[PDB]
Ligand binder design. Structure first.
Ligand SMILES: COc1ccc2[nH]cc(CCN)c2c1
Ligand SMILES: [Ca+2]
Length: 223
């Protein structure tokens, strides 16, 4: 996250870190046994880390649970990033409490202008690299479809939205991939892609979760 603030330990209780020997992507806990992330995060041998703040120090509220199955969306296109969503099933159910909690799926899509919270352990610099060990947060609005398409001609599908600031300076960045965009207490987005981070006229692009609720619910019910 570039231009954000330190969230505070366990203030984003649905945020997860995906770990394959190191943090490599975020995700969101949507019930006691399932995590949603980006399809571009896919790999084998994922351990899901819940209740994290400092990802390099055991602070006492963590739960570490191996993934038993990953399901990339059937229409994910790695070249265009269309349908950039994946589900991960945990080998055992997480113990839910005030610091580890699921986030609700949306019943409707959020409109442009809605303020959302984006969070992650990604790079905090737009040039150069500095990775934080504690979770960073950013409040940002959903941008209109027309501004999003004007910023990324030819590249925005109906399964994507832009959020952030056309002036630059505040954005998600490398290592935030797969993490949550939460608006009005519902998961509306997944950190997906962008052109660099925090550049003028290049806001972050997010998977539009409301288009996937039926797929998520049917997949969870059968797996
Ligand atoms: C350094 O630029 C990158 C590189 C990879 C990335 N993945 C996801 C994002 C979010 C950008 N809003 C991103 C940014
Ligand atoms: Ca920790």
């Amino acid at each position: 996250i570039v231009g954000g603030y330190t969230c505070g330990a366990n203030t984003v209780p649905y945020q997860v870190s995906l770990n394959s020997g190191y943090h490599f992507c975020g995700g969101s806990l949507i019930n006691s046994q399932w995590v949603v992330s980006a399809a571009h995060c896919y790999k084998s041998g994922i351990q899901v880390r819940l209740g994290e703040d400092n990802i390099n120090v055991v602070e006492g509220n963590e739960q570490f649970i191996s993934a038993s199955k990953s399901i990339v969306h059937p229409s994910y296109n790695s070249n265009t990033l269309n349908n950039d969503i994946m589900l991960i099933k945990l080998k055992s159910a997480a113990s839910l409490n005030s610091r580890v909690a699921s986030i609700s799926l949306p019943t409707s899509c959020a409109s442009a202008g809605t303020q959302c919270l984006i969070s992650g352990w990604g790079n905090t610099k737009s040039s150069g690299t500095s990775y934080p060990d504690v979770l960073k947060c950013l409040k940002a609005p959903i941008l209109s479809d027309s501004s999003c398409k004007s910023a990324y001609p030819g590249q925005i599908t109906s399964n994507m939205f832009c959020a952030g600031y056309l002036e630059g300076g505040k954005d998600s960045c490398q290592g935030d991939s797969g993490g949550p965009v939460v608006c009005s207490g519902k998961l509306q987005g997944i950190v997906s892609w962008g052109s660099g981070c925090a550049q003028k006229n290049k806001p972050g692009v997010y998977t539009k979760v409301c288009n996937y609720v039926s797929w998520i619910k049917q997949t969870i019910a059968s797996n």
